[PDB]
Scaffold this motif. Structure first.
Motif, PDB file in Angstrom:
ATOM      1  N   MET A  24       0.816  -1.216   0.000  1.00 47.21           N
ATOM      2  CA  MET A  24       0.000   0.000   0.000  1.00 47.21           C
ATOM      3  C   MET A  24       0.851   1.269   0.000  1.00 47.21           C
ATOM      4  O   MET A  24       0.493   2.252  -0.647  1.00 47.21           O
ATOM      5  CB  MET A  24      -0.951   0.017   1.201  1.00 47.21           C
ATOM      6  N   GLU A  25       1.976   1.235   0.713  1.00 47.36           N
ATOM      7  CA  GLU A  25       2.873   2.389   0.801  1.00 47.36           C
ATOM      8  C   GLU A  25       3.369   2.815  -0.584  1.00 47.36           C
ATOM      9  O   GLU A  25       3.298   3.992  -0.935  1.00 47.36           O
ATOM     10  CB  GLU A  25       4.060   2.097   1.729  1.00 47.36           C
ATOM     11  N   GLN A  26       3.853   1.852  -1.368  1.00 42.33           N
ATOM     12  CA  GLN A  26       4.284   2.119  -2.746  1.00 42.33           C
ATOM     13  C   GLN A  26       3.140   2.674  -3.597  1.00 42.33           C
ATOM     14  O   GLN A  26       3.353   3.566  -4.418  1.00 42.33           O
ATOM     15  CB  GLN A  26       4.876   0.858  -3.396  1.00 42.33           C
ATOM     16  N   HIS A  27       1.932   2.152  -3.389  1.00 47.94           N
ATOM     17  CA  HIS A  27       0.737   2.659  -4.069  1.00 47.94           C
ATOM     18  C   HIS A  27       0.395   4.083  -3.633  1.00 47.94           C
ATOM     19  O   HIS A  27      -0.109   4.870  -4.438  1.00 47.94           O
ATOM     20  CB  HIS A  27      -0.462   1.726  -3.834  1.00 47.94           C
ATOM     21  N   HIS A  28       0.665   4.414  -2.368  1.00 48.28           N
ATOM     22  CA  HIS A  28       0.403   5.763  -1.852  1.00 48.28           C
ATOM     23  C   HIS A  28       1.264   6.797  -2.575  1.00 48.28           C
ATOM     24  O   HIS A  28       0.759   7.837  -3.002  1.00 48.28           O
ATOM     25  CB  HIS A  28       0.640   5.855  -0.341  1.00 48.28           C
ATOM     26  N   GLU A  46      13.447  16.049  -8.782  1.00 47.09           N
ATOM     27  CA  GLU A  46      13.828  14.656  -8.528  1.00 47.09           C
ATOM     28  C   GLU A  46      14.266  14.423  -7.077  1.00 47.09           C
ATOM     29  O   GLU A  46      14.083  13.329  -6.540  1.00 47.09           O
ATOM     30  CB  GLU A  46      14.949  14.224  -9.480  1.00 47.09           C
ATOM     31  N   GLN A  47      14.850  15.443  -6.450  1.00 53.01           N
ATOM     32  CA  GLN A  47      15.250  15.345  -5.044  1.00 53.01           C
ATOM     33  C   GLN A  47      14.030  15.223  -4.131  1.00 53.01           C
ATOM     34  O   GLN A  47      13.975  14.328  -3.288  1.00 53.01           O
ATOM     35  CB  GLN A  47      16.099  16.551  -4.616  1.00 53.01           C
ATOM     36  N   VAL A  48      13.053  16.110  -4.315  1.00 52.41           N
ATOM     37  CA  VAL A  48      11.879  16.148  -3.440  1.00 52.41           C
ATOM     38  C   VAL A  48      11.034  14.875  -3.562  1.00 52.41           C
ATOM     39  O   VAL A  48      10.551  14.354  -2.557  1.00 52.41           O
ATOM     40  CB  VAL A  48      10.998  17.405  -3.692  1.00 52.41           C
ATOM     41  N   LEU A  49      10.873  14.372  -4.784  1.00 53.12           N
ATOM     42  CA  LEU A  49      10.132  13.133  -5.011  1.00 53.12           C
ATOM     43  C   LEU A  49      10.777  11.959  -4.281  1.00 53.12           C
ATOM     44  O   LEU A  49      10.076  11.106  -3.740  1.00 53.12           O
ATOM     45  CB  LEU A  49      10.033  12.817  -6.506  1.00 53.12           C
ATOM     46  N   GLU A  50      12.108  11.919  -4.263  1.00 50.78           N
ATOM     47  CA  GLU A  50      12.835  10.848  -3.572  1.00 50.78           C
ATOM     48  C   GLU A  50      12.787  10.980  -2.050  1.00 50.78           C
ATOM     49  O   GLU A  50      12.869   9.976  -1.342  1.00 50.78           O
ATOM     50  CB  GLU A  50      14.290  10.770  -4.049  1.00 50.78           C
ATOM     51  N   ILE A  97      10.055  12.344  -0.624  1.00 51.96           N
ATOM     52  CA  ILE A  97       8.655  11.944  -0.470  1.00 51.96           C
ATOM     53  C   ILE A  97       8.511  10.428  -0.566  1.00 51.96           C
ATOM     54  O   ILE A  97       7.853   9.811   0.268  1.00 51.96           O
ATOM     55  CB  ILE A  97       7.746  12.609  -1.537  1.00 51.96           C
ATOM     56  N   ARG A  98       9.132   9.837  -1.585  1.00 57.01           N
ATOM     57  CA  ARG A  98       9.097   8.390  -1.776  1.00 57.01           C
ATOM     58  C   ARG A  98       9.631   7.672  -0.538  1.00 57.01           C
ATOM     59  O   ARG A  98       8.948   6.817   0.022  1.00 57.01           O
ATOM     60  CB  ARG A  98       9.908   7.980  -3.011  1.00 57.01           C
ATOM     61  N   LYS A  99      10.841   8.030  -0.115  1.00 58.38           N
ATOM     62  CA  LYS A  99      11.467   7.414   1.061  1.00 58.38           C
ATOM     63  C   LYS A  99      10.615   7.598   2.318  1.00 58.38           C
ATOM     64  O   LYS A  99      10.451   6.667   3.110  1.00 58.38           O
ATOM     65  CB  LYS A  99      12.866   7.992   1.300  1.00 58.38           C
ATOM     66  N   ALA A 100      10.083   8.805   2.489  1.00 54.17           N
ATOM     67  CA  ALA A 100       9.226   9.122   3.624  1.00 54.17           C
ATOM     68  C   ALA A 100       8.004   8.210   3.661  1.00 54.17           C
ATOM     69  O   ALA A 100       7.713   7.606   4.694  1.00 54.17           O
ATOM     70  CB  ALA A 100       8.794  10.579   3.566  1.00 54.17           C
ATOM     71  N   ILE A 101       7.304   8.109   2.530  1.00 52.46           N
ATOM     72  CA  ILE A 101       6.076   7.315   2.436  1.00 52.46           C
ATOM     73  C   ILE A 101       6.333   5.814   2.641  1.00 52.46           C
ATOM     74  O   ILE A 101       5.565   5.146   3.327  1.00 52.46           O
ATOM     75  CB  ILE A 101       5.338   7.556   1.093  1.00 52.46           C
ATOM     76  N   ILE A 102       7.413   5.297   2.060  1.00 54.04           N
ATOM     77  CA  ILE A 102       7.788   3.891   2.240  1.00 54.04           C
ATOM     78  C   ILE A 102       8.152   3.606   3.700  1.00 54.04           C
ATOM     79  O   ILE A 102       7.834   2.541   4.226  1.00 54.04           O
ATOM     80  CB  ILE A 102       8.971   3.489   1.323  1.00 54.04           C
ATOM     81  N   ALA A 103       8.804   4.568   4.347  1.00 55.23           N
ATOM     82  CA  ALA A 103       9.196   4.442   5.752  1.00 55.23           C
ATOM     83  C   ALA A 103       8.012   4.229   6.707  1.00 55.23           C
ATOM     84  O   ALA A 103       8.176   3.616   7.764  1.00 55.23           O
ATOM     85  CB  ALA A 103      10.001   5.661   6.179  1.00 55.23           C
ATOM     86  N   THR A 104       6.829   4.726   6.338  1.00 48.31           N
ATOM     87  CA  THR A 104       5.628   4.564   7.170  1.00 48.31           C
ATOM     88  C   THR A 104       5.088   3.126   7.192  1.00 48.31           C
ATOM     89  O   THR A 104       4.142   2.832   7.928  1.00 48.31           O
ATOM     90  CB  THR A 104       4.495   5.516   6.736  1.00 48.31           C
TER      91      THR A 104
END
Ligand SMILES: Cc1ncc(C)n2nc(CCc3nc(-c4ccccc4)cn3C)nc12
Ligand SMILES: [Mg+2]
Ligand SMILES: [Zn+2]
Length: 312
Positions: free
Chosen positions: A134-138, A163-167, A169-176
């Motif tokens: 679900m995290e990856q889908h988020h 590209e920096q901000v997306l990464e 955001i990506r890392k942040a969301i996956i971390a949850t």
């Protein structure tokens, strides 16, 4: 309406507090996020109409589930705001942009089901996303909204910083993903107890952000007891709805997702605070001392859950 919104001056004082509960201000949540964004990242970072059009589409893409809903998204954004505000200097401007946005989108289009469910019952989402389903889908939903007409709040950034901000955001969301937290906390504690933790180190930085995303995701446990207890009800409502589907397929769900085992909730929370919550905010306070009130509030609710078990 959202562009012409103004926050009451009494909210301005109390929004800064870690324990602040957004619950009572449902209609002000979109405007509260704007306020927190402007106070954290300045008034010029996003184009007002792009941000407001983005926010309201993020809201629309949260479902009406018991827990993982618009309310939860904003509550998780606020806790980050409080962490960022008390540790403003440690993080970059672009990190504060992405992390606030990431918290707001971190459960986007959440279906009310765990990663275990989707994987075990081959849901389409489990087919294209193996771990942290679900995290990856988020994050995938976050990017989709960013690519709608007039929603790209980062459009004015350079391709590098985009590209920096997306990464972040990506890392942040996956971390949850709470499955990844336990490993993340272990190393961060190791890096602290030895004295080897360093915020110039990118991987250490991403791990600290990861812990902050967990602290924020769990922050209902750092509110005043009545708010904590009420939100706990919303959590189990979502778990129990998932267990019912497993029961409908004959399969007995785990005790946590079994409404027939509601008696063991206080014990279940007692374990959650000891195994997850207290260790989460303990390591976070050691790295970011201004976040200490989160540990204090968690401890108080821990003793409350102990008080509930003893019949008081
Ligand atoms: C407060 C909070 N914030 C965030 C998250 C993700 N969670 N998740 C829980 C469930 C805790 C929990 N309840 C049980 C349990 C309950 C009844 C019967 C048997 C077991 C076990 N566990 C671990 N609470 C939270
Ligand atoms: Mg989630
Ligand atoms: Zn969440």
């Amino acid at each position: 309406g959202l562009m012409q919104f103004t926050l009451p001056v009494r909210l301005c004082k109390e929004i800064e507090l870690f324990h602040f509960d957004i619950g009572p201000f449902e209609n002000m949540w979109p405007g509260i996020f704007v306020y927190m964004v402007h106070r954290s990242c300045g008034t010029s970072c996003f184009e007002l109409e792009k941000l407001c059009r983005f926010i309201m589409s993020v809201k629309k893409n949260y479902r009406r589930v018991p827990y993982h809903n618009w309310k939860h998204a904003v509550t998780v954004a606020h806790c980050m705001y409080a962490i960022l505000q008390n540790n403003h200097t440690l993080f970059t401007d672009l990190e504060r942009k992405g992390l606030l946005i990431a918290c707001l989108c971190h459960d986007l289009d959440h279906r009310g089901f765990s990663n275990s469910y989707l994987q075990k019952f081959d849901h389409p989402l489990a087919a294209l996303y193996s771990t942290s389903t679900m995290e990856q889908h988020h994050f995938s939903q976050t990017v989709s909204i960013l690519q709608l007409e007039g929603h790209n709040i980062f459009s004015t950034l350079s391709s590098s910083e985009y590209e920096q901000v997306l990464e972040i955001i990506r890392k942040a969301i996956i971390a949850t993903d709470l499955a990844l937290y336990f490993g993340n906390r272990k190393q961060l504690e190791e890096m602290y107890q030895t004295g080897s933790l360093n915020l110039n180190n990118q991987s250490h930085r991403d791990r600290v952000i990861g812990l902050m995303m967990t602290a924020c995701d769990l922050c209902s446990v750092t509110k005043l007891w009545p708010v904590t207890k009420l939100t706990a009800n919303d959590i189990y409502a979502e778990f129990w709805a998932e267990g019912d589907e497993m029961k409908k397929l004959g399969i007995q769900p785990i005790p946590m997702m079994d409404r027939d085992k509601k008696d063991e909730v206080p014990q279940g929370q007692l374990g959650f605070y000891n195994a997850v919550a207290i260790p989460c905010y303990t390591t976070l306070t050691q790295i970011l001392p201004p976040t200490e009130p989160l540990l204090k509030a968690c401890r108080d609710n821990l003793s409350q859950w102990e008080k509930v078990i003893r019949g008081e």
